[PDB]
Design a protein around this ligand. Structure first.
Ligand SMILES: [Mg+2]
Ligand SMILES: [Zn+2]
Lengths: 49, 175, 1111, 146, 49, 98
DNA sequence: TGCATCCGTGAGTCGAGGGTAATAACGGCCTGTACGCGTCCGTTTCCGGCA
DNA sequence: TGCCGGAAACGGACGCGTACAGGCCGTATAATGGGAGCTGTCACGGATGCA
């Protein structure tokens, strides 16, 4: 839900993600950037990190 | 009465007393009437004379009467930037004086260690270095089993010693 | 000619012009004078419409007065506006930060109806801001100019649309007023002509007619051919005037219990009483022209009318029917056709007079409301007009218009051209005008009605492309606000000398000739077929008999700044646009020599810009100096003019004014008496003349990079003076009062060497980045100190020093001397803002040289930064050893379609060298049409090629053929215009000839010192903890979303984490990373961003439970 | 369409009773700072006005209720409170947007997230950074590629 | 000495594609203009106007 | 809660009245923001120190405690928890609608 | 069932930039807050004798 | 010269008498439903109300 909210139509995304009690997994690429953890691409994956 | 009282009480973001807002409106009315029947903007001394208060009181009232602004108005010619992003946060850490103070503490610990244990302990207890509360001569004497006169003699000799250039040439630039 | 001291600038113009360039500041001056009611405007209007000369203020007071109560038992009136002398002179206002204003006086009359009593009083309306000799306003010291606005005139506007489904035309009409409601009569997919009022679509025209009182028989009689309207009558399903009024009320007024008398007056209030529906004089005139109601009636009664409404409906139905002409019963016949909004017959120009009049009206409306409110509450027979009137709303409206309004722009002054072109500026965006987001591509186009009324070239190239324009040189503004254009009327092929001003409608009605039409030097046309612009903008060949109008002169369609571009007709349009827009950003140099080759619009542009002192009355120069000139008039009296030595312009540029007359010269009223910032001998000079090469040199002039000779640095050819000011106010505080003094806490005596006894620096004392300019101290108060600080203070014997140091320090990256210090005080009774006890201004000026990175540009938009400044020795030089000064690139010329620079270079070389046409055996054929005193010219002579009628290419070739030698027998430039250059670095001659000449280039206001910026650790934002932005504060660069995408795409993670966490937002991370860098340790791991924490708090505040979970 | 939200409510341990609001939360003051500028001029954060309106209308409703007022006045005050809370959560979503001085619409909590000026696209994805610079550029034909 | 062998990044707005960010080895120069290698102008879409 | 940057989920749910009043440290019941004269936050106002923490580092409202030694204690007279000034950034309040 | 109406969303990128409309005003009182000399702890000179 | 060992003012806690700051209450002819500013974007999707 975080990626969709940061992308577009934030009000409509939040009002339906909250109702669904949706829980993010922070496994994508925008979420790691938002929360300040290393992205899972390039030198951020476990193979190299 | 109710409408005036409520408007005075809740008209502004910064609350103003009823008498203060009353005198503010009185001063505004007086200024408007004076400008109308004079043709020239009057001086604060003239306002004070007409309202029968002091000019410093007039200036204080005028300063109080000002209302705040909003941190989200488009200040620029185009609308892409608010007012709040042009304001410095003075409460933040300078990020340079912090490391300067850390190294000052390190140097102070060194210059203290260049002396002996007795002097270092008494001066640290006296000025509250290891603890926030600075102890007094009576407390130091009670801790060390000697009198406050002996503590004062030690403090004086240590203060004289620390003013030598061999011990102040490193601490001079930290002020 | 026509200027007594005009330098002899020989011109290449082929054809004479009958009409001279009008006063370039007329659009401002005449407008404000009409607003005032000045005798000059009064006599002009008497010459051109003496029927009713009324000023803006007079019109406002007349349309306001009289003011009545609800009972109508007592009234008040206003009359006779009259101004007073200015309260302070212009220079004094600009210095002491006042506003250039003058008191306003009116004659208010209070009249009682029941008893009968008149009370005439002199009422002071307010301090009315005034417009100076140069057409600019001064508000709080600074100079401001209010730009004219382009808005669509109110009236009727018909259009047709295609439904693209049934493929039938759907006509419509919008009667758009000013200060009123809307109403549209469209044609639907079916045959029910809708009457949408205030965006409520229902209710065909039959109901509206019945509400107006028209019976079905009258409707059928007036509209018999209308099959659509007869069908609507058949399916009206509503009969009765009162029933129609009931329907009107329930539709337009939901939620209100309708009555039979409220509805009877609702329509009259909405569209017939002037209180709530007043289309302006322009709207009434436009409606009368479009329908043809009254052809001779003086314009009045600005409210709508039922005859106008029925005429509009009939116009719509006949337009749908497909007729060609219409005759209103009792009115002249008028053609029927669609109306275009982009046509300049409908886009009136709301100038400064009308803008200030509108603000005055909206203020006086509030004043009249207050008068009416207090007029009933206060007891009768005990009131006077002084008690009645409140002028605070009016003065507040004037002030709130002049300040904080995007139509009242900060008058940019980089040069007199910049000032002049900021005047005469037409901006389509503003209050009541279209915004950029709603600005479609349709309006950003050069409609064919712009010819002679607005420049198609000059306009901003950024996001405002097409929304901002400038008036043409010969353009004139109609009293209604339309833009006129002069023309010479031709009769039976005889081009007369009578000049008739036409607007868009008249120009479309008639047939115009071409400016460069080959007249026979007698009035006739040599060829029957001439170029012609038709009504729809069509360009055709027409026999000379049908032509009935002709342009006054070539270059009429162009504006001033673009008319200053030589060889314009050879340039493209985009590069001409760039050159015109970048001619206004040139900085004033220290010498400002006149250009070699130019147009005839430099002398007029300079002397009409107001930045050149000109003797008003003829006489003999008595005393001349660097500060003042005393002209001894022909009759006894003398007059002294004060120059402006090193005055700061609004954009930090020098504004010197050097006299150009000696102690015994005689000057005639109108002669230039003193140069300006960018002037030379009276005419205009935005740059210098520099030797030019068109060869690519070792990749330093690569991709619009520019190479400069060091001679410009050595001799200060391109060296500008920039003046910056600093303001610091010692103000009252809660804990005490700040004072300006030498005694600054925790400071040494080294930095105090340059400070005088009272705290401020010395005049002429140079300053460097980080110095002390004004020593100000603030009461610090009571604050707990660290134990280490206490120990240090005890060790060194220094006291607490309970006040804090906040002194005016010159910011990062500034240097230069100090010119003057202006210090205000409360003790000497100066007008200071409340709470400020001491104010002081320090002026710092630096002599900036030319350097790499500085922006240079010619007059054809061939811009470019300075790549490298070579020494004099290693630059190409001609056969005689003269080195070139600048080195352009050849690749940039052809693909930008601006060979106008090449032609200018050739003509400049010809002008600099000097030529002589050898007419030993007759005048050569190529120079047959060349004017006299042009076959031979002295070296370094100036020429003047006009915009659209100038030097031809054959004439350029002929001039280049004869290029009389410099000092020895040597023609350094061959016939082609090239030369043999020697490589000053290696030594061997260049294997092929290279074009050389004297181009005119200017130093732009995009200097490196204003752009270079850096940051390591500075101030931080308040709500979020990110660094600030911009060079004004310290600020850091913005790492945008696209940069983040590139960072991610690079396979990169750690750099992104660093730039997003321990560089911007990690509050407990920035200090740790700084400490680690200082001590030489590894960079610690980052933390979560404070911005993310703020987002989490905001989400929790929006009643959205957000919890971060570990497992 | 209905079963979408119905099943969304049903499948979780979530209750639809929370959709109606009984206790509005207050954002921490630091995120809506009241800063004093140079010269004693203050500058609000435009959320304080909305919160003040909410508090004033709630208190006035309490006073009317415990004093005893006609249903017309009580319902009008309740609608006042409802509209004020709606403006606080999303200004301009319904009806005329609430505006302060200068006819400038106020900024609500949802305006801090919507659009390009929202928190996400303005500070969460792209931020001003330290150790940065900016200057004009010239050609360096004598330099190497690296 | 402290700048020798310390790569820096150059950015140009807009950053259309991946090659809008590149890393170079800095060298101190006079003036106040960031000298740019002529061969990266294509990648950066940067002219010297 | 402590944000040690070891996260695996970010759950957004429909907050309830109990959740809001559990988040809130106190209830604001007066529409004052700042005192016009002393420039100190008003009691129970939109900036109340008692609810949202102290404006100054380790300094209560009446000054009875002004040093690090009194850390984590509650001023029995003023009602302000004496702690770091940054705390005013993380505490929330709630309004009990009538 | 189709049709119109309406609503809502998004529509660039880098500097240059910081302060505003609109009136009963007093008596009586009252409790609270403050705050200006004096004697105490304590710290910067004092001065009498002195080594 | 510096040190020793107290001695001289410059400053934290105050009853007290006073200043004023702020708040509450109450005013008596009669007056009894708003100003008001808007409505020059364009494509898309979708929900709603009614023929
Ligand atoms: Mg470019
Ligand atoms: Zn306390």
């Amino acid at each position: 839900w975080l990626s969709a909210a940061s992308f577009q139509e934030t009000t409509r995304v939040l009002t339906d993600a909250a109702i669904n009690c949706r829980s993010d997994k922070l496994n994508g690429l925008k979420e790691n950037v938002i929360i300040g953890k290393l992205i899972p691409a390039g030198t951020g994956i476990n193979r190299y990190r | 009465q109710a409408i005036t009282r409520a408007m005075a009480d809740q008209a502004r973001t910064i609350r103003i007393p009823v008498h203060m807002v009353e005198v503010i409106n009185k001063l505004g009315r007086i200024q408007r009437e004076l400008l109308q029947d004079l043709g020239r903007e009057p001086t604060p001394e003239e306002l004070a004379k007409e309202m029968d208060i002091t000019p410093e009181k007039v200036l204080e009232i005028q300063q109080y009467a000002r209302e705040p602004i909003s941190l989200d108005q488009t200040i620029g010619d185009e609308g892409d930037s608010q007012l709040g992003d042009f304001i410095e946060d003075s409460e933040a850490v300078v990020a340079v004086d912090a490391v300067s103070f850390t190294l000052l503490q390190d140097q102070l610990q060194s210059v203290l260690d260049t002396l002996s244990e007795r002097e270092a302990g008494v001066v640290r207890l006296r000025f509250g270095l290891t603890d926030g509360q600075p102890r007094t001569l009576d407390e130091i004497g009670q801790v060390y089993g000697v009198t406050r006169e002996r503590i004062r003699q030690i403090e004086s000799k240590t203060m004289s010693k620390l003013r030598h250039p061999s011990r102040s040439q490193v601490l001079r630039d930290y002020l | 000619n026509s200027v007594p001291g005009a330098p002899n600038r020989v011109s290449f113009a082929k054809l004479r012009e009958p009409l001279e360039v009008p006063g370039l500041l007329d659009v401002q001056t005449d407008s404000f004078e009409w607003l005032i009611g000045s005798p000059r405007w009064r006599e002009s209007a008497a010459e051109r419409g003496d029927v009713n000369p009324v000023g803006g203020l007079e019109e406002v007071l007349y349309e306001l007065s009289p003011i009545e109560d609800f009972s109508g038992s007592m009234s008040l009136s206003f009359s006779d506006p009259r101004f007073d002398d200015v309260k302070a002179p212009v220079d004094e206002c600009k210095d002491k930060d006042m506003t250039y204003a003058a008191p306003l006086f009116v004659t208010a009359e209070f009249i009682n109806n029941n008893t009968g009593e008149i009370k005439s009083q002199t009422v002071f309306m307010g301090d009315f801001p005034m417009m100076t000799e140069k057409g600019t306003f001064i508000i709080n010291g600074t100079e401001r100019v209010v730009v004219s606005q382009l808005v669509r005139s109110p009236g009727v506007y018909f259009d047709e649309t295609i439904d693209k489904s049934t493929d039938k035309t759907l006509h419509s009409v919008k009667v758009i007023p000013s200060r009123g409601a809307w109403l549209e009569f469209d044609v639907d997919k079916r045959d029910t002509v809708g009457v949408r009022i205030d965006r409520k679509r229902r209710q065909p025209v039959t109901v509206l007619l019945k509400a107006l009182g028209w019976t079905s028989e009258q409707i059928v009689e007036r509209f018999g051919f209308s099959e659509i309207m007869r069908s609507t009558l058949e399916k009206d399903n509503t009969v009765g005037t009162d029933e129609a009024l009931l329907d009107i009320y329930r539709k337009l007024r939901p939620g209100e219990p309708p009555t039979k008398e409220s509805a009877q007056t609702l329509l009259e209030n909405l569209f017939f009483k002037e209180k709530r529906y007043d289309l302006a004089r322009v709207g009434r005139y436009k409606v009368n022209k479009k329908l043809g109601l009254h052809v001779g009636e003086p314009i009045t009664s600005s409210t709508l009318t039922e005859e106008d409404v029925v005429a509009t409906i009939e116009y719509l139905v006949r337009l749908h029917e497909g007729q060609t002409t219409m005759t209103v019963p009792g009115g002249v016949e008028v053609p029927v056709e669609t109306d275009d909004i982009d046509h300049f017959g409908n886009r009136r120009l709301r100038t400064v007079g009308e803008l200030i009049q509108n603000q005055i009206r909206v203020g006086m409306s509030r004043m009249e409301r207050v008068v009416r409110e207090r007029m009933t509450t206060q007891d009768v027979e005990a009131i006077t007009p002084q008690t009645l009137i409140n002028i605070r709303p009016v003065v507040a409206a004037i002030k709130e218009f002049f300040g904080t309004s995007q139509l009242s722009q900060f008058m940019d002054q980089n040069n007199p051209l910049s000032g002049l072109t900021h005047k005469r500026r037409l901006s389509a965006l503003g209050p009541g005008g279209l915004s950029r987001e709603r600005a479609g591509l349709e309006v950003r186009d050069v409609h064919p009605s712009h010819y002679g009324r607005m420049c198609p070239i000059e306009t901003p190239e950024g996001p405002n492309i097409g929304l901002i324009g400038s008036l043409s040189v010969y353009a004139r503004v109609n009293p209604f606000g339309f833009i006129e254009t002069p023309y010479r009327k031709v009769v039976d092929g005889v081009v007369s000398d009578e000049i008739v001003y036409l607007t868009a409608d008249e120009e479309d009605r008639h047939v115009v000739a071409q400016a460069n039409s080959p007249i026979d030097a007698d009035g006739r046309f040599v060829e029957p077929r001439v170029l012609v612009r038709r009504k729809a903008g069509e360009v055709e060949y027409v026999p000379s008999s049908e032509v009935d109008y002709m342009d006054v002169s070539p270059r009429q369609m162009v504006s001033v700044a673009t008319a200053m571009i030589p060889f314009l007709e050879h340039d493209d349009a985009n590069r001409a646009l760039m050159g015109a827009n970048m001619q206004r950003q040139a900085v004033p140099l220290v010498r400002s020599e006149a250009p070699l080759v130019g147009t005839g619009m430099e002398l007029r542009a300079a002397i009409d810009a107001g930045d050149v002192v000109v003797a008003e009355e003829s006489g003999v120069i008595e005393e001349v100096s660097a500060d003042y000139i005393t002209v001894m008039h022909d009759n006894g009296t003398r007059r002294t003019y004060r120059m402006r030595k090193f005055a700061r312009s609004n954009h930090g540029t020098c504004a010197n004014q050097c006299p150009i007359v000696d102690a015994g010269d005689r000057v005639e009223a109108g002669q230039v008496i003193a140069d300006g910032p960018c002037t030379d001998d009276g005419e205009m000079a935005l740059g210098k003349n520099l030797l030019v090469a068109i060869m690519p040199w070792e990749g330093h002039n690569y991709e619009d990079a520019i190479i400069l000779s060091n001679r410009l640095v050595e001799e200060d050819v391109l060296t500008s003076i920039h003046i910056e000011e600093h303001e610091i106010d010692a103000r009252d505080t809660k804990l005490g009062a700040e004072e300006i003094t030498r005694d600054i806490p925790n400071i040494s005596d080294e930095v105090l060497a340059d400070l005088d006894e009272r705290g401020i620096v010395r005049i002429g004392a140079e300053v460097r980045d980080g110095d002390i300019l004004v020593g100000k101290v603030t009461p610090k108060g009571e604050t707990e100190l660290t134990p280490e600080e206490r120990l240090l203070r005890a060790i060194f014997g220094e006291k607490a020093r309970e006040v804090r140091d906040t002194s005016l320090k010159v910011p990062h990256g500034e240097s230069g001397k100090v010119i003057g210090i202006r210090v205000f005080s409360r003790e000497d009774e100066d007008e200071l803002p409340a709470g400020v006890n001491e104010l002081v201004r320090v002026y710092v000026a630096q002599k900036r040289k030319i350097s790499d990175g500085d922006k240079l540009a010619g007059r054809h938009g061939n811009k470019g930064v300075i790549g490298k400044i070579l020494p004099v020795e290693d630059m190409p030089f001609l056969a005689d050893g003269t080195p070139v000064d600048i080195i352009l690139n050849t690749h940039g010329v052809p693909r930008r379609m601006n060979i106008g620079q090449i032609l200018e270079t050739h003509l400049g070389w010809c002008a600099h060298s000097g030529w002589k046409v050898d007419a030993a055996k007759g005048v050569p054929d190529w120079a047959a049409r060349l004017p006299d005193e042009l076959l031979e010219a002295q070296p370094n002579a100036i020429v003047s090629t006009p915009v659209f009628d100038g030097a031809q290419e054959a004439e350029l070739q002929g001039l280049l053929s004869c290029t009389l030698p410099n000092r020895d027998g040597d023609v350094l430039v061959d016939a082609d215009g090239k030369a043999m250059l020697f490589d000053g670095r290696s030594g061997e001659p260049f294997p092929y000839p290279v074009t050389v000449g004297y181009m005119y280039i200017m130093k732009l206001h995009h200097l490196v010192d204003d752009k270079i910026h850096a940051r390591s650790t500075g101030p931080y934002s308040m709500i979020t903890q990110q660094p600030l932005g911009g060079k004004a504060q310290f600020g850091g660069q913005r790492f945008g979303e696209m940069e983040c995408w590139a960072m991610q795409a690079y396979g990169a993670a750690y750099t992104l984490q660093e730039l997003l966490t321990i560089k911007s937002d990690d509050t407990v991370g920035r200090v740790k990373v700084y400490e680690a860098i200082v001590k030489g340790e590894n960079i610690p791991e980052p933390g979560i961003p404070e911005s993310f924490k703020v987002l989490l708090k905001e989400l929790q505040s929006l009643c959205l439970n957000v919890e971060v979970l570990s497992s | 369409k209905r079963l979408k939200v119905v099943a969304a409510f049903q499948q979780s341990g979530n209750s639809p009773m929370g959709m109606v609001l009984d206790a509005v939360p207050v954002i921490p003051p630091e995120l809506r700072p009241m800063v004093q500028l140079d010269g004693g001029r203050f500058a609000t954060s435009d959320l304080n006005d909305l919160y003040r309106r909410v508090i004033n209308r709630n208190n006035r409703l309490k006073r009317l209720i415990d004093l005893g007022a006609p249903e017309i006045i009580v319902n009008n005050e309740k609608r006042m409170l409802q509209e004020s809370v709606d403006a606080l959560f999303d200004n301009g979503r319904r009806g005329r947007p609430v505006t302060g001085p200068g006819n400038r619409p106020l900024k609500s909590l949802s305006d801090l997230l919507k659009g390009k000026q929202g928190r996400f696209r303005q500070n969460l994805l792209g931020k001003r950074v330290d150790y940065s610079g900016r200057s004009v550029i010239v050609v360096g034909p004598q330099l190497k590629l690296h | 000495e402290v700048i020798a062998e310390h790569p820096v990044l150059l950015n140009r707005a807009p950053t259309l594609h991946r090659l809008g960010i590149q890393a170079f080895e800095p060298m101190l120069v006079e003036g106040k203009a960031i000298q740019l290698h002529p061969l990266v102008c294509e990648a950066f879409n940067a002219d010297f106007d | 809660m402590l944000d040690v940057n070891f996260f695996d989920e970010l759950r957004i749910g429909l907050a309830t009245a109990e959740d809001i009043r559990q988040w809130s440290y106190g209830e604001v019941k007066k529409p004052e923001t700042i005192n016009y004269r002393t420039l100190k936050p008003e009691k129970d106002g939109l900036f109340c120190e008692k609810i949202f923490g102290p404006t100054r580092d380790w300094e209560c409202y009446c000054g009875k405690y002004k040093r690090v030694r009194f850390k984590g204690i509650i001023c029995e007279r003023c009602g302000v928890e004496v702690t770091r000034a940054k705390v005013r950034r993380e505490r929330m309040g709630h309004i009990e609608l009538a």
